[PDB]
Amino acid sequence: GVEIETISPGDGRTFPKKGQTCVVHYTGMLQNGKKFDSSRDRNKPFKFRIGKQEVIKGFEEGAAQMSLGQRAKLTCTPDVAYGATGHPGVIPPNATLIFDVELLNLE
Q1: DSSP 52-106
Q2: Out of 15, 36, 48, 98, which one is annotated catalytic?
Q3: Active-site residue 59, yes or no?
Q4: How far apart are CA 93 and CA 107, in angstroms?
Q5: Range 21-103: architecture per CATH
Q6: What are the Cα distances from residue 71, in Å, to 30, 36, 95?
Q7: What angle do CA 70, 60, 47 make, to 5 degrees?
Q8: Could you give phi then psi for residue 82, rounded to 5 degrees?
Q9: What is the C-alpha separation between 77 and 82, in angstroms, rounded?
Q10: Which of 22, 40, 66, 92 could serve as a FRET partner for 12 with CA atoms 20 to 30 Å apart?
Q11: Annotated catalytic residue, options 82, 91, 98, 100
Q12: Which of 14, 28, 107 is nearest to 66 (CA)?
């Protein structure tokens, strides 16, 4: 389950498609918890493509459901990313993820 809560401005039409490498100012947030990841710190805004299952499933579907300039707010279910396993030391098992995602991309 991907929940989209968009801070309004953007264009609403440049949708990410297959074979397109897109650029995201992501920011990780734990529900009832602190941050765990941020592209704002490293300031290299994570050039990644679409259709290769590089990222987790909750962030993969939320990437295609945005457009250029938009600033959404993801709510990733545990079963699509880490809720059974848990990323070791960083993500506990059964964790619901929150992301600040802005799509300022290319292609």
Answers
A1: S--S-HHHHHHHHT--TT-EEEEEE-HHHHTTTT--TTTS-SS--EEEEEEE---
A2: 36
A3: no
A4: 35
A5: Roll (3.10)
A6: 18, 19, 23
A7: 70
A8: -145, 5
A9: 9
A10: 40
A11: 82
A12: 14
Q: Give the pair of three-digit tokens for residue 65.
A: 């459901």
Catalytic residue among 50, 59, 91, 99: 99
Q: Which secondary-structure segment (H or E) carries 39?
A: helix 39-42
Please state the length of the chain: 107
Domain spans in the chain, listed from the N-terminal domain onward: 21-103
- Which of 13, 11, 7, 17 is CA-nearest to residue 71? 7
26, 50, 91, 100: the active-site residue: 26
Give the number of other CB atoms < 10 A from CB of residue 91.
19
Is 50 one of the annotated active-site residues of the chain? no
Question: Which among 4, 15, 48, 56 is annotated as catalytic?
Answer: 56
Tell me if residue 37 is catalytic. yes
Instruction: Let me know: does 100 contact 40? Beta carbons within 8 Å.
Output: no
- What method did the depositors use to determine the structure? cryo-EM
